[PDB]
Design a protein around this ligand. Structure first.
Ligand code: CLA
Ligand code: CLA
Ligand code: CLA
Ligand code: CLA
Ligand code: CLA
Ligand code: CLA
Ligand code: CLA
Ligand SMILES: CCCCCCCCCCCCCCCC(=O)OC[C@H](CO[C@@H]1O[C@H](CS(=O)(=O)O)[C@@H](O)[C@H](O)[C@H]1O)OC(=O)CCCCCCCCCCCCCCC
Ligand SMILES: CCCCCCCCCCCCCCCC(=O)OC[C@H](COP(=O)(O)OC[C@@H](O)CO)OC(=O)CCCCCCCCCCCCCCC
Ligand SMILES: CC1=CCCC(C)(C)[C@H]1/C=C/C(C)=C/C=C/C(C)=C/C=C/C=C(C)/C=C/C=C(C)/C=C/C1=C(C)CCCC1(C)C
Ligand SMILES: CC1=C(C/C=C(\C)CCC[C@H](C)CCC[C@H](C)CCCC(C)C)C(=O)c2ccccc2C1=O
Ligand code: SF4
Lengths: 92, 107, 137, 107, 160, 731, 30, 42
């Protein structure tokens, strides 16, 4: 009980949730984004990332930087669709 | 001086028959290192018939000993006065057991 | 009080007796009355003959003194054995029958030391008593 | 001693496979096993095994069954005795196989 | 064929057979014909030859060392190597465990369970031994009826 | 007394137990008298500074001795033929035969031949002269001085850090991921490009030259133009003689894959690209957590938020933030487990994929390094579990960890321990049974009756990586697979060339012997984990002693009361797990050394045939390979292996001595020492002298520890001697 | 190849490090 | 037969010895009549 208080970063909120979905503070800067916005973002990100990955699957000695960058949208789309769910079930 | 003594034979079940090595004398078994062959030669045994009779005597003595144990626990158990005879128990052991044993063996 | 003139149980001597630590730190003593001259076993090793009357014995450890006392109480029927502790200053102390009655039977006057007001399952955790002066009780 | 006696003379027992001394080789290995197995009892204590038995008894109870004779780890004295018995058996058996294989090969 | 060669057509397997037979024949050459040693060595030779022929025809695969190897991955062409033997084991082991558990409960509900466990009631023990032949359906029936798994609140546990 | 200044309970002890326990508790700061959290953390900080200084001094000494008494300059010329000498020998006990036997390495004085591989490592880095090594040693001495000064300074009143600083997780994580890991690997890439590669191509680059010498003819224009592929054009030819310009290229970053032909090690350009890539990745990873600005995460928020809605984990990871931040033992256990895994990975990967030039042909060096790192890994894993148990005993707060993952672990500890015991028994029973079956059939002369299981799963993994030895045609063994077509023009050519040549240790062919020894290793890992996990989970209590946390971590016992309570502590669980960890690593290193020895002599069939029964290991590995070692010295002379033979017997001696402490327990020795004290006190001319500390027998825990230490030293020294001497006497 | 002057410079740096190590040991002992 | 003698035969060590001897005989005879069975014949 004599342990020193644990320092945490500024503006650290309570994100623990036993509800159906988290509190939308889990999404940080994107907490106010709409569920429809997240859905469209996830679909667009998935399509663009899949296309840019296919444009690089037989990787050459000189891959395109824009295709490399856009390939990172496929992992991004997962987070986006998870957020869409969270924001749909948080009321938005 | 040519054939290795052997008095144990194994059964051919899982390839353990390899243990029946070529000890000698047209015989294959497990070489023994107890000296029983030399004991018997010194005793003057020259046949398997004499060894059969030795085995019979051993079996009869085993039966006698087990019967004696049962008899002296359940039928006639000596008392503590009988047991506490150190002088008599040493006289008899020394003279009878040891002396007569080595006298009979000398004979 | 202890009388240092009580005779001793005519022991023949042993190498299990007390040593320089007895003269430097602490030396225990046991006194008991015997109705006859019996043979008992020294807690240090060997046999000794207790006298008819009062017998005083010197040992190095309270455990040895109490083992001798237990032997007297059980083997024989002597229960008037008193144990003392002597320092080099000569400050004899009285220990075993502290309140004149053996501890195995309750006696009015004793104060409970080391008693706790819960079961062992209610002890606190070292995490709870860490960096604090609290006690796990 | 390590080289000219143990390493040198262990060749007969370690090259006994396929021969009538293959039994000696197998017993060599098994005696090594028992000697090592003794160290589990000799280096260990009863509390660890009683707690492990507690966990195993929980596993058995989870299936609605457990012996009426409650399982207990060996007493301290019994653990020491088991360790010593296995130690002696393993060491003496290793020497037994080694000696018999070596001498029967070279004699 | 998986990564090795069939043992029926392996020079290494044939060489091992030849070596074993030659060892046995060398041992046999020093014994008179018709004597018990000669008969025993001839029977050993016959057993070795039969074993090698049966292994060859079994479809076992043999490596460069000339010894059969087992493909225990699930392939149905090699089920007899691990799976079917494993099924036979599991059957027997479940039999043993089921009958043992049944006898444990039977002795639990007795006047002296400890006496029943050290000095057995072999009529009831044989009864359970017989019961053990449909242990899979019996064990699943126990599980579904809830007589197998005990509740968490009814099993003793140490404090945390 | 004032020896254990940190414990009056020890300072007031009138026996030698005071000295022993003051020695053994010197570094348990938490248990010291009047220890506050701030003082604890600051002392740990200073001790870390001192430890870093010690490491720097140790490496500096290695460099200095190799520069002074070494043969590095004449080794860089013919590295495959010259033996690298570690340091000179000056022992006034050596005879002339010993001096002559140890005078090797082309030097003219007795020397030790290094088995650490520092020669190959430094040669690959770019060190060529003894002056380079001397300068490195000077710099490391300076760095040790700097870190000692830092440790002293951060203990001063105005420089002592605060606990709000010690418990700042986000800033430390950001800085360690970005600078300590990321920028450090980026700097290593810079070194490899500016010095190592030009040095490998025969162009000296140093402080007097690196500011005027371009690492690439194009300079940084390809970097600042986006034409990064220009840095991979013109790699080193396959006929490049390492250290010379013959066959060299101009590329600085590539992904050739595989190994350099002459050096038989990974391409230095590939290593540079690897380090640059992981450097930028780590720099990115180090920007994740929140600091004095608004961007980033908070670990507390993430932990609290991560709770599956199904409730199968309960409260999820709530409270773990505080638990970990406030428990130094939790952090120590996590760090030790991770470092142990990483050092095992270092061992496993560094033998399959050598990175230093010509290291693969230094057989004794490779075996020594592998054994070293595997033993270190096992020690670290045992320590991680021991400190997890210590955390459970000391720092665990159930109310804080109300129904989170940790509390659930404690809840079903019984299920965990029982299933671990079952899997251990499973593995042991059946592995030992197969080994004994093979032993008996081979003994009866029927090796065809052995149960030999092909490790088809591992062979399938090898074929997937591209090994055509086994016919599977899966992913990279298949020429028409998408996996093959994706990497056909980046690294697959070189990688396939490396994997499908039998000249290397990359994905060695495996068989039933490998299968069996692998399941033995599985048994060993599972049983060590069983002991350690049981100790950790039962540390707080069991049905026998349901109040163990009151007694702590390393109490001797609880008496003979409830049927006997010997070894009822988590410390005792550690003590037994250390035997099991020594057994498992012994198995692992035996397997590695025997397989590689057979491959090196070219008789891999010997392993393939004898590894299937234990007599094969006892005869064709130990008995067969111990000959040169045990002949190191003999009635007819001696050679340089005499030292290793002596250390072999030394290890046997100390091992058997540890058996004493492990089998014989205290009461006997305490009743013997009593008689000894009586004798000294009553001996004339010797009672003039008197002990100041009462001579007592060793404590129960102390004896366990001493026996364990003797056992471990014997284990390690015996196997070190065996491995090094046998490898050096066979090749 | 390594000169006595080089070895002496190394020894001087080692002595400086020893002095700093003694200082740190004292500070930690406190 | 005496019920006490039957109980003595029912004691745990006697039953274990008899049952394991019976099992050993079963396995031995199986290997005697069908030897060298390294596999289930299919
Ligand atoms: C960097 C990692 C690390 C750190 C910071 C710590 C820190 C700590 N450990 Mg340790 N520990 C570690 C790794 C680490 N450990 C590992 C890897 C293991 C597994 C082996 C352990 C296992 C372990 C246990 C089981 C215990 C600790 C304990 C402790 C605490 C007290 C230390 C003590 O008593 O010193 C001891 C002081 C010494 C001087 C050590 C003497 C013995 C060593 C091993 C030398 C023996 C080798 C010999 C000299 C060589 C002879 C050579 C031959 C040629 C003659 C302390 C917080 C103790 C504690 O307080 O627990 C609550 C405790 O019980 N640790
Ligand atoms: C208990 C032992 C024992 C027994 C049962 C016999 C029995 C016999 N001995 Mg005697 N004998 C013995 C010990 C014994 N001997 C010893 C120890 C010696 C050495 C002194 C002799 C020396 C001896 C001789 C010299 C002769 C006998 C003879 C005989 C036979 C006539 C008496 C009879 C078969 C006589 C005989 O016919 O021998 C074949 C005979 O002449 N014995
Ligand atoms: C470690 C991973 C692993 C695991 C868990 C398995 C598991 C399995 N493999 Mg194997 N396999 C593996 C790796 C693995 N494999 C690898 C790496 C290879 C390549 C070397 C193979 C190659 C392989 C082949 C070629 C085959 C298998 C098959 C099987 C299955 C056999 C049993 C079956 O079909 O039951 C089916 C029966 C039931 C579901 C119920 C039966 C009911 C009554 C009692 C009859 C089984 C699920 C066989 C299969 O058909 O798998 C689908 C098969 O033909 N495996
Ligand atoms: C001749 C070959 C041989 C021999 C001598 C043995 C010997 C042994 N096996 Mg067996 N085993 C074999 C072949 C063999 N096995 C094969 C081919 C397989 C592959 C299928 C197995 C699979 C196997 C398993 C899975 C287990 C054993 C176990 C054992 C040991 C204890 C068995 C026991 O107590 O039964 C008496 C029976 C009981 C006490 C009842 C409970 C245990 C049985 C095995 C449950 C069976 C039904 C259950 C639903 C199966 C679920 C399995 C699943 C979780 C994987 C024993 C040393 C057990 C062991 O090592 O435990 C530590 C064990 O759990 N064996
Ligand atoms: C960029 C800034 C930075 C840097 C460089 C460091 C560096 C360090 N800090 Mg940290 N620290 C920082 C910021 C930074 N800190 C901040 C901001 C804080 C406050 C929030 C702290 C608070 C802090 C504390 C409280 C402590 C440290 C400690 C340390 C040291 C850790 C031990 C070590 O050397 O591991 C070296 C590790 C590496 C070089 C990399 C990881 C190693 C893995 C296994 C990769 C292996 C690479 C390669 C394959 C190895 C082979 C090499 C060769 C043999 C072939 C290290 C010197 C500890 C210490 O020792 O203090 C003196 C310590 O106690 N720091
Ligand atoms: C070679 C020596 C040896 C052996 C065989 C074992 C065996 C075992 N140890 Mg280990 N142990 C050893 C040394 C050894 N230990 C040492 C030196 C120590 C240090 C003190 C420990 C400390 C230790 C701990 C702390 C723990 C173990 C555990 C285990 C089990 C591991 C699982 C396993 O392999 O099950 C397979 C079983 C075996 C390999 C043994 C079977 C032996 C034979 C083949 C069975 C058949 C018996 C036969 C029919 C008898 C006939 C003879 C009769 C007529 C008299 C098992 C009982 C763990 C445990 O209990 O997990 C459940 C555990 O917690 N051991
Ligand atoms: C190799 C293993 C080993 C060793 C070294 C010893 C040693 C000893 N045992 Mg034994 N013991 C062992 C295993 C071993 N035991 C085991 C496994 C057990 C358990 C069953 C026991 C159980 C046991 C008991 C119960 C007793 C002994 C006794 C003794 C002592 C015999 C007399 C004596 O002091 O000789 C001295 C000789 C040696 C210790 C040999 C090594 C010393 C060398 C030759 C000299 C090296 C000194 C060197 C210069 C130091 C330099 C230090 C530094 C500069 C580097 C001695 C300490 C008895 C005893 O104490 O009697 C007095 C006793 O009662 N042992
Ligand atoms: C090669 C040869 C193999 C092919 C031969 C196939 C015949 C298998 C016969 C199995 C059998 O008789 O199970 C007998 C068990 C009795 O179990 C018992 O059932 C009891 C209740 S009762 O019997 O069901 O009323 C229950 O209390 C008890 O625990 C349980 O053990 O029957 C059942 O309980 C369920 C039978 C499953 C029905 C579906 C099978 C479809 C095929
Ligand atoms: C490309 C990359 C893809 C990512 C792959 C990484 C692993 C995916 C994880 C799956 C874990 C799976 C897992 O562990 O799930 C565990 C899952 C955990 O759920 P939580 O408790 O988080 O939440 C459940 C709540 O939402 C309901 O209250 O619980 C379930 O069982 C729910 C259903 C799972 C989903 C059911 C899937 C059914 C699969 C259909 C069968 C398909 C195969 C046949 C053809
Ligand atoms: C990435 C990749 C490449 C090739 C194909 C492949 C399928 C392998 C694929 C995937 C690989 C993966 C998923 C690898 C998995 C490796 C993993 C999960 C390794 C983890 C090992 C875990 C270890 C040691 C754990 C040790 C735990 C310890 C001490 C715990 C101690 C503790 C205790 C006992 C009490 C509480 C406190 C504490 C400290 C936690
Ligand atoms: C392993 C081990 C155990 C656990 C071992 C136990 C409980 C033994 C139980 C074994 C079974 C019940 C014996 C029957 C099975 C055997 C395979 C058959 C051989 C035994 C008979 C010949 C008596 C202890 O209880 C123990 C206690 C004290 C010190 C050391 C140890 C110890 O090392
Ligand atoms: S033996 Fe030693 S350890 Fe085990 S209980 Fe008795 S005293 Fe404690």
């Amino acid at each position: 009980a004599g342990y020193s208080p644990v320092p945490s970063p500024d503006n650290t909120k309570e994100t623990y949730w036993e509800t159906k979905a988290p509190s939308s503070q889990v999404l940080g800067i994107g907490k106010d984004v709409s569920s429809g916005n997240y859905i469209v973002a996830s679909v667009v990100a998935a399509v663009v990332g899949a296309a840019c990955t296919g444009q690089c699957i037989p990787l050459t000695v000189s891959p395109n930087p824009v295709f490399i960058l856009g390939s990172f949208l496929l992992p991004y789309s997962w987070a986006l669709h998870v957020a869409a769910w969270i924001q749909r079930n948080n009321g938005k | 001086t040519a054939v290795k003594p052997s008095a144990q034979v194994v059964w051919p079940i899982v390839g353990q028959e390899v243990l029946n090595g070529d000890v000698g004398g047209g015989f294959q078994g497990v070489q023994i290192t107890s000296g029983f062959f030399q004991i018997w030669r010194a005793s003057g045994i020259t046949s398997e018939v004499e060894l059969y009779w030795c085995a019979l005597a051993g079996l009869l003595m085993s039966g006698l000993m087990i019967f004696a144990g049962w008899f002296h626990y359940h039928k006639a158990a000596p008392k503590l006065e009988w047991f506490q005879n150190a002088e008599s128990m040493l006289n008899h052991h020394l003279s009878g057991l040891l002396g007569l044993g080595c006298l009979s063996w000398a004979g | 009080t202890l009388n240092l003139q009580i005779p001793s149980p005519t022991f023949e001597g042993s190498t299990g007796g007390w040593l320089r630590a007895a003269e430097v730190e602490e030396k225990y003593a046991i006194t008991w009355t015997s109705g006859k001259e019996q043979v008992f076993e020294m807690p240090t090793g060997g046999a000794a003959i207790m006298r008819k009357g009062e017998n005083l014995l010197y040992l190095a450890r309270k455990e040895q003194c109490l083992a001798l006392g237990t032997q007297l109480k059980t083997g024989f029927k002597i229960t008037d054995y008193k144990i003392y502790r002597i320092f080099p200053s000569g400050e004899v102390q009285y220990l075993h029958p502290k309140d004149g009655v053996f501890p195995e039977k309750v006696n009015a006057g004793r104060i409970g030391v080391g008693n706790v007001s819960h079961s062992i399952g209610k002890n606190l955790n070292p995490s709870q008593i860490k960096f604090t002066n609290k006690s796990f009780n | 001693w390590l080289r000219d006696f143990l390493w040198a003379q262990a060749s007969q027992v370690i090259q006994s496979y396929g021969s009538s001394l293959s039994a000696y080789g197998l017993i060599f290995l098994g005696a090594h096993f028992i000697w090592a197995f003794s160290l589990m009892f000799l280096f260990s204590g009863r509390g660890y095994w009683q707690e492990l038995i507690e966990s195993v008894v929980w596993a058995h109870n989870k299936l609605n069954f457990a012996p009426a004779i409650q399982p207990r780890a060996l007493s301290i004295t019994q653990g020491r005795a088991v360790g010593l018995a296995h130690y002696l058996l393993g060491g003496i058996g290793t020497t037994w196989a080694f000696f018999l294989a070596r001498i029967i090969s070279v004699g | 064929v998986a990564g090795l060669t069939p043992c029926k057509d392996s020079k290494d397997f044939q060489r091992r057979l030849d070596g074993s037979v030659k060892k046995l024949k060398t041992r046999l050459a020093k014994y008179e014909k018709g004597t018990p040693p000669a008969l025993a060595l001839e029977k050993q030779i016959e057993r070795t030859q039969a074993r090698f022929e049966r292994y060859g025809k079994a479809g076992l695969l043999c490596g460069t060392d000339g010894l059969p190897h087992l493909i225990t991955d699930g392939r149905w062409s090699h089920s007899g190597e691990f799976v079917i033997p494993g099924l036979f084991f599991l059957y027997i082991a479940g039999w043993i465990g089921w009958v043992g558990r049944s006898y444990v409960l039977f002795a639990r509900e007795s006047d002296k369970p400890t006496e029943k466990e050290i000095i057995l009631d072999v009529p009831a023990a044989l009864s359970f031994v017989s019961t053990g032949f449909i242990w899979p359906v019996s064990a699943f029936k126990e599980f579904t009826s809830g007589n197998l798994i005990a509740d968490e609140s009814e099993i003793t546990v140490s404090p945390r | 007394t004032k020896f254990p200044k940190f414990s009056q309970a020890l300072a007031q002890d009138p026996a030698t137990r005071r000295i022993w326990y003051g020695l053994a508790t010197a570094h348990d700061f938490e248990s010291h008298d009047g220890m506050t959290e701030e003082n604890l953390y600051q002392k740990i900080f200073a001790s870390h500074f001192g430890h870093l200084a010690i490491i720097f001094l140790w490496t500096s000494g290695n460099l200095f001795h190799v520069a002074w008494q070494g043969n590095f300059e004449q080794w860089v010329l013919n590295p495959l033929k010259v033996k690298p000498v570690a340091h000179a020998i000056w022992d006034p006990h050596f005879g002339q035969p010993a001096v002559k036997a140890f005078t090797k390495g082309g030097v003219f004085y007795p020397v030790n031949i290094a088995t650490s591989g520092v020669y190959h490592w430094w040669y690959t880095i770019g060190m060529r002269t003894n002056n380079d090594l001397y300068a490195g040693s000077l710099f490391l001495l300076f760095l040790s001085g700097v870190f000692l000064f830092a440790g002293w300074l951060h203990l001063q009143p105005k420089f002592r850090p605060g606990l709000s600083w010690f418990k700042n997780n986000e800033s430390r994580l950001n800085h360690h991921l970005s600078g300590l890991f990321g920028f450090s690997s980026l700097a290593w890439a810079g070194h490899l490009i500016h010095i190592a590669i030009p040095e490998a191509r025969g162009q000296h680059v140093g402080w007097d030259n690196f500011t005027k010498t371009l690492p690439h003819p194009a300079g940084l224009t390809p970097f600042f133009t986006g034409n990064w592929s220009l840095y991979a054009d013109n790699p080193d030819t396959a006929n490049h003689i390492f250290g010379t310009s013959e066959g060299s290229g101009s590329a600085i970053l590539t992904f050739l894959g595989g190994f350099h032909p002459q050096t038989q090690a990974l391409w230095l350009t590939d290593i540079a690209h690897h380090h640059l890539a992981i450097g930028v990745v780590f720099i990115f990873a180090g920007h994740m957590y929140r600091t004095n600005w608004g961007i980033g995460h908070s670990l507390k928020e993430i932990l609290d938020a991560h709770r599956p809605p199904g409730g199968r984990l309960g409260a999820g990871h709530k409270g773990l933030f505080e638990t970990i931040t406030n428990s130094l033992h939790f952090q120590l256990g996590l760090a030790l487990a991770s470092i142990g895994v990483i050092t095992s990975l270092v061992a496993q990967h560094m033998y399959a994929l050598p990175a230093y030039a010509f290291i693969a042909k230094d057989y004794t060096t490779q075996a020594a390094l592998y054994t070293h790192h595997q033993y270190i890994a096992g020690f670290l894993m045992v320590g991680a579990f021991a400190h997890g148990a210590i955390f459970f005993v000391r720092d665990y707060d159930p109310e804080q960890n109300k129904n989170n993952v940790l509390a659930r672990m404690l809840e079903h500890k019984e299920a965990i321990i029982s299933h671990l015991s079952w899997v251990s028994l499973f593995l042991g029973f059946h592995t030992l049974g197969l080994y004994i079956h093979n032993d008996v059939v081979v003994a009866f002369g029927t090796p065809e009756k052995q149960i030999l299981v092909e490790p088809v799963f591992a062979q399938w993994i090898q074929a997937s990586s591209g090994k055509a030895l086994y016919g599977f045609d899966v992913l990279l063994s298949s020429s028409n697979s998408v996996a093959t077509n994706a990497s056909n023009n980046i690294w697959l050519p070189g990688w396939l060339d490396a994997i499908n040549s039998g000249k290397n240790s990359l994905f060695l062919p495996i068989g039933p012997g490998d299968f069996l020894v692998h399941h033995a290793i599985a048994l060993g890992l599972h049983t060590t984990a069983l002991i350690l996990v049981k100790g950790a989970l039962d540390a707080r209590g069991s049905k026998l002693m349901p109040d163990k946390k009151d007694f702590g971590y390393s109490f001797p016992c609880d008496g003979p009361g409830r049927g006997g309570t010997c070894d009822i502590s988590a410390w005792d669980a550690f003590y037994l797990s250390m035997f099991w960890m020594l057994n498992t690593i012994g198995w692992v290193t035996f397997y590695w050394h025997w397989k590689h020895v057979t491959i090196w002599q070219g008789n891999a069939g010997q392993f393939n045939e004898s590894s299937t029964y234990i007599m094969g290991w006892l005869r064709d590995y130990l008995w067969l390979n111990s000959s040169p070692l045990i002949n190191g010295y003999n009635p007819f002379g001696m050679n340089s292996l005499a030292v290793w033979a002596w250390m072999f017997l030394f290890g046997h001696l100390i091992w058997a001595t540890g058996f004493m402490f492990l089998i014989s327990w205290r009461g006997y020795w305490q009743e013997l020492i009593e008689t000894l004290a009586w004798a000294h006190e009553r001996t004339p001319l010797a009672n003039l002298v008197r002990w100041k500390d009462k001579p007592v027998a060793l404590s129960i825990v102390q004896a366990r520890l001493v026996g364990l230490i003797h056992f471990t030293v014997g284990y390690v020294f015996t196997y070190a001697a065996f491995v090094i001497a046998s490898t050096t006497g066979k090749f | 190849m390594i000169s006595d002057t080089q070895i002496f410079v190394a020894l001087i740096l080692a002595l400086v490090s020893l002095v700093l190590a003694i200082r740190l040991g004292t500070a930690l002992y406190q | 037969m005496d019920s006490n003698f039957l109980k003595y035969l029912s004691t745990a060590p006697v039953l274990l010895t008899v049952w394991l001897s019976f099992t050993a005989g079963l396995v031995i005879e199986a290997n005697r009549f069908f030897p060298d069975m390294l596999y289930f014949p299919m």
